[PDB]
Amino acid sequence: PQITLWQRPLVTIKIGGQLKEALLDTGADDTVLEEMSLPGRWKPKMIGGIGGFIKVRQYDQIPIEICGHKAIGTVLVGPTPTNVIGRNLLTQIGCTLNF
Amino acid sequence: PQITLWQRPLVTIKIGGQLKEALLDTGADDTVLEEMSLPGRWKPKMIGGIGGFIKVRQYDQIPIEICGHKAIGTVLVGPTPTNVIGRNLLTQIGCTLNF
Ligand SMILES: COC(=O)N[C@H](C(=O)NN(CCC[C@@]1(O)Cc2ccc(cc2)C/C=C\CNC(=O)[C@H](C(C)C)NC1=O)Cc1ccc([C@H]2C=S=CC2)cc1)C(C)(C)C
Ligand SMILES: [Cl-]
Ligand SMILES: [Cl-]
Ligand SMILES: [Cl-]
């Protein structure tokens, strides 16, 4: 699709069998989701946003659908204001910015 | 142009007589720049991201030039850790997401 930006670029993702809404965010290196259960072991990451730093749990090699486009990659989980899909997964689904 | 998301999508903007580098951010409602001077009236605003909120000055109807594209919009100024161009200006230069 071509998504314009008059509204928040909110899409439906699927992860661990469940549908969620997330924000397509080209200003984010990483993908960070609100608290949820994921399988396997996790590593620590500190990520910085506009308001400061938060600790998150890093899960790797997690399958995730993003408006129906299949990706498998690194998902961070922690206290974010919303689910944000970052460049690590945007690149996997062939996203570019165009003007 | 078409802009890849292998790297951070950084562009030069011209604003208030100054050249600055900034991050094209589809996930951002607003445009926020590190501390600088702008002319005319302003009002305080709290904006939120990962980490919490910061207090900024809101200037409206500010001319800006992005990758050679002229627009005019609200610009927020404050202690953001990096310069972000948000949807309020991205729309004006015809910027869309594509995959
Ligand atoms: C490389 O680090 C990152 O990629 N950080 C990422 C990130 O914060 N990058 N930044 C882009 C802005 C992120 C976000 O779009 C993320 C976002 C957060 C909340 C919301 C939407 C989008 C919804 C709630 C309120 C609306 N808030 C906003 O629209 C704000 C804008 C007003 C700034 N939007 C955002 O803050 C800008 C940003 C970049 C770097 C840094 C850091 C550099 S050093 C310490 C921090 C801070 C901010 C992230 C998401 C992984 C934490
Ligand atoms: Cl990844
Ligand atoms: Cl505006
Ligand atoms: Cl349009």
At residue B45, φ and ψ (nearest 5 deg) are -145, 145
Closest residue of A to B88, CA-based? A6
Beta bridge mates, B9: none
Of residues A77, A73, A98, the one with CA closest to residue A88: A73
Tokens of B80: 């953001």
Amino acid making up residue B14: K
Domain definitions of chain A by residue range: 1-99
C-alpha distance from A17 to closest chain B C-alpha (Å): 23
Confirm if B99 and A69 have CB atoms less than 8 A apart. Answer: yes
Categorise residue B68: left if φ over 0, alpha if ψ from -120 to 50, beta otherwise.
Answer: left
Does the domain at A1-99 match CATH 2.40.70.10? Answer given as yes
Residue B54, beta-bridge partner list: B47
How far apart are alpha carbons B99 and B26 in whole angstroms?
14
C-alpha B63/C-alpha B32 separation (Å) is 14
Overall resolution, Å: 1.8
| A68 Cβ neighbours under 8 A, 6+ residues apart | none
B59: Cβ contacts below 8 Å, ≥ 6 apart:
B38, B40, B41, B42, B74, B75, B76, B77
Annotated catalytic residue: which of A25, A29, A30, A60? Answer: A25
The alpha carbon of B89 and the centre of ligand 4 are apart by a number of angstroms equal to 12
Selection from A89, A99, A94, A95 nearest residue A14 by Cα: A89
Distance from CA of B62 to the nearest CA of A (A): 19
Distance in angstroms between the alpha carbons of the first and the last residue of chain A:
15
Residue by residue, DSSP assigns A50-79 as: TTEEEEEEEEEEEEEEETTEEEEEEEEES-
Rounded CA separation B2/B95 (Å): 10
Q: Do A95 and B5 touch (CB under 8 A)?
A: yes
Distances (CA, A) of A78 to A24, A30, A53, A75, A85: 18, 12, 11, 10, 14
- Chain B residue closest to A32 (CA)? B50
Residues 6+ apart with CB under 8 A from A10: A21, A22, A23, A24
Experimental determination technique = X-ray
- Among residues A90, A82, A63, the alpha carbon closest in space to that of B8 is found at A90
B51 closest CA partner among B29, B87, B79: B79
